[PDB]
Design an enzyme around this catalytic site. Structure first.
Site, PDB file in Angstrom:
ATOM      1  N   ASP A  21       0.883  -1.351  -0.157  1.00  0.00           N
ATOM      2  CA  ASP A  21      -0.104   0.110   0.003  1.00  0.00           C
ATOM      3  C   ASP A  21       0.767   1.370  -0.048  1.00  0.00           C
ATOM      4  O   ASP A  21       1.760   1.160   0.372  1.00  0.00           O
ATOM      5  CB  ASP A  21      -0.851   0.085   1.258  1.00  0.00           C
ATOM      6  N   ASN A  69     -10.771   0.786  -4.527  1.00  0.00           N
ATOM      7  CA  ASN A  69     -10.621   1.784  -3.333  1.00  0.00           C
ATOM      8  C   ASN A  69     -11.064   2.965  -3.947  1.00  0.00           C
ATOM      9  O   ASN A  69     -11.779   3.781  -3.000  1.00  0.00           O
ATOM     10  CB  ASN A  69      -9.110   1.818  -3.163  1.00  0.00           C
TER      11      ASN A  69
END
Lengths: 241, 241
Positions: A21, A69
């Site tokens: 991430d 996302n």
């Protein structure tokens, strides 16, 4: 504070999984476009792989996020979809020479045929290596994997080749995408969020989790070593289970 | 640093789950016998429940560990097995008056009949309350819950009342022990271990995790408030998803 020789003195997890991430956040920090962040995260895969291989790791699973996302423009979506081919074009000969086995899990139908053909070639070209497994989780979700396992079990029950009383935990693991892999002993999540985000829900039931604020494109050897040092320190804790 | 009025200004998770770890470690720290630690952990359930109810929490799930971490002597096993009855004898009238609904998940066949009968009475006596749900997870495991869901789905497919093409994520959730509950937005684990330990694997796919070194018998109002403050701060982070 942990050196590489310090780490090699202790236990090395056989299967490490990393949630990669922070690529976008890194680009913004550096005043670079988002696709530069994606490209750099692709490059840090090679350095991390090399170090894990040198430390004797047996399986390195790397998870990349999908578009879910936050919706992104076509240019960026297409760029991400071509990154697996660029990675293999740039790095596959080294991977072959390092005795790495390339594998993938997730919904392969989400990639275009040209990209699938290149990924499959890399898997086949490295399948007779017997060294570290580099396992990419692309378009992968823990809940949909669990549902798919349940549906395949129900199909065998429907067809009459499986009795429900023979379905147990061990059997269920063999119906997941990870069936030929031991569960990760260590999960690392970069970029500061303290969440699993629908990654290997079944398989991480007993894993150690290490969370770091370091963004994935900044996750160099010294941060990887610190995560291992933390993993090792936990095995030394006194006071009972 | 976070006051109770500070916390009430922000978002309160509707469903909080806590892994109640550290009772044994606490007894040892205090030079008290292990069963004193268990008894005290039972008492901290009441204080935590009261605070969560006062803050407007809608579901508080509390997980107690089974004997599987480390084999224990018969005296201690029997003591743990009688604790649900002592909790209900001591605290059920208050729970009734506070409009709490008592519920349980896990393998109820692991408890003796006398204890089951008392638990069932408490569930029935509070089922017409409509306030906070106090959900105990006893003899509960995430993997066995998932397997049980898959087996019930396969039985309906076998009997012909379910088509495999209708099995999806939403349907699968309805076959878990948590079917009438929203997934926890916040998971808190006390006693310093950074692991899920086979707790609600499916349901915590997107939950925020807050890990604290505080031992469960020491988890007072101010620590609960700090965990909520951390949960709230995460929702305020800038920089994108």
């Amino acid at each position: 504070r942990y050196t590489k020789e310090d780490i090699l003195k202790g236990e090395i997890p056989e299967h490490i999984a990393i949630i990669m991430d922070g690529n976008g956040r890194w680009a913004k920090k550096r005043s670079l476009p988002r696709i530069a962040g994606h490209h750099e995260g692709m490059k840090v895969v090679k350095r991390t792989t090399k170090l894990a291989n040198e430390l004797g790791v047996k399986v390195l699973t790397l998870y990349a996020f999908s578009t879910e996302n936050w919706k992104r423009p076509k240019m960026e979506v297409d760029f991400l979809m071509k990154l697996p081919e660029e990675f293999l074009n740039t790095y596959l000969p080294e991977l072959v020479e390092e005795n790495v086995q390339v594998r993938i899990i997730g919904d392969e139908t989400a990639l275009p045929a040209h990209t699938l053909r290149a990924i499959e070639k890399a898997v086949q070209d490295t399948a007779q290596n017997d060294g570290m497994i580099l396992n990419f989780a692309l378009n992968y979700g823990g809940r949909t994997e669990i549902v798919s396992a349940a549906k395949s079990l129900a199909e065998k029950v429907k067809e009459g080749s499986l009795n429900i009383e023979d379905i147990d935990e061990s059997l269920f693991s063999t119906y997941l995408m990870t069936e030929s892999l031991q569960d990760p002993e260590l999960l690392i999540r970069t970029s500061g969020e303290i969440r699993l985000s629908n990654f290997m829900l079944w398989q991480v039931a007993y894993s150690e989790f290490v969370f770091t604020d370091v963004l994935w494109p900044d996750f160099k050897e010294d941060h990887f070593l610190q995560a291992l040092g933390e993993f090792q320190q936990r095995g030394r804790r006194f006071g009972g289970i």
